[PDB]
């Protein structure tokens, strides 16, 4: 039900005018926290987090991620010498956070990846850092020496859970706010094949069921989707296409199932799509 995620990236080759280190925070899949190596500051991204937290909160977050930036800077140099790699593109990825399931079960996660492949993963049930690759064994030796397993256990089970419950309470109005999609039905004729398209513009929340219907019957297999893609303002977009015969286009209807709609919305090409209200 409720999730807290901290997405960290350390790069050797980021690109021109782009930061090498990026740290972003998410509450229920929505961005709220942001940090980059160029700005060197932890800043809010939503109105609900900024209005409910003071400057003292963002100061503690800045110094903790500034240190994380320095630690990951060392990690890129340590792992390149360990793997005996000579230049090129190398990436260190970090994933941290906790899930508060609807039944009350708490799941904790703290794992890393080197060059897009699993490196280390903390196992909460055994209190040990699992080394996925043979090059991740000296990392486990450093962890067993320091004894970070106990300090990480109390964070994922108590600290992470406490603050996620606060963020859920702060952003309850925004996360639960439903947004109706602007639907449009289109068609393209090519080599005796009529490709019908159905686009849903700016919907919230993210889960949606957009299906094609022929003579009032669902055509799941024949329909091709592009997945749920995000918009810059926070809303989502999706498109579903179907191959049909020319002169049969009006027999097809677009069905949209969403939380903002009390009943599934039916749309046709000739009726004007979403302009039919």
């Amino acid at each position: 039900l409720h999730t807290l995620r901290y997405i960290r990236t350390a790069m050797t080759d980021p690109g021109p005018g782009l930061p090498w280190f990026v740290d972003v925070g998410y509450v229920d899949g929505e961005l709220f926290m942001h940090y980059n190596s160029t700005a060197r500051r932890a800043v809010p991204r939503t109105e609900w987090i900024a209005a409910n937290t003071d400057q003292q909160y963002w100061d503690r977050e800045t110094q903790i991620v500034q240190g994380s930036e320095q630690i990951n800077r060392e990690n890129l140099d340590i792992l390149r010498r360990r793997y005996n790699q000579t230049g090129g593109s190398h990436t260190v990825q970090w994933m941290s956070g906790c899930d508060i399931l609807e039944d009350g079960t708490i799941r904790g996660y703290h794992q890393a990846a080197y060059d897009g492949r699993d490196f280390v993963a903390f196992d909460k049930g055994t209190m040990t850092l699992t080394a996925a690759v043979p090059e991740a064994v000296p990392t486990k030796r450093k962890w067993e020496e320091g004894g970070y397993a106990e300090g990480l256990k109390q964070y994922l089970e108590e600290t992470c859970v406490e603050w996620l419950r606060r963020y859920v309470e702060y952003g309850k109005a925004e996360l639960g706010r439903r947004e109706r999609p602007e639907v449009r039905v289109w068609g393209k004729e090519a080599d005796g094949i009529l490709t019908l398209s159905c686009r849903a513009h700016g919907f919230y929340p993210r889960p949606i069921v957009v299906s094609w219907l022929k003579d009032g019957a669902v055509r799941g297999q024949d329909a091709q989707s592009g997945g749920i893609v995000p918009n810059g303002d926070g809303t989502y977009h999706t498109w579903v296409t179907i191959d049909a015969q020319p002169g049969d286009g009006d027999k097809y209807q677009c069905r949209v199932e969403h939380a903002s709609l009390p009943q599934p919305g039916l749309y046709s090409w000739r009726s004007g799509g979403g302009l039919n209200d």
Binding site: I64, G67, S96, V120, T139, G146, G151, T159
Partner: peptide, 10 residues
């Protein structure tokens, strides 16, 4: 609330 920098050590 982010976790301490020492837990990012490799």
């Amino acid at each position: 609330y982010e976790l301490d920098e020492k837990f990012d050590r490799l």
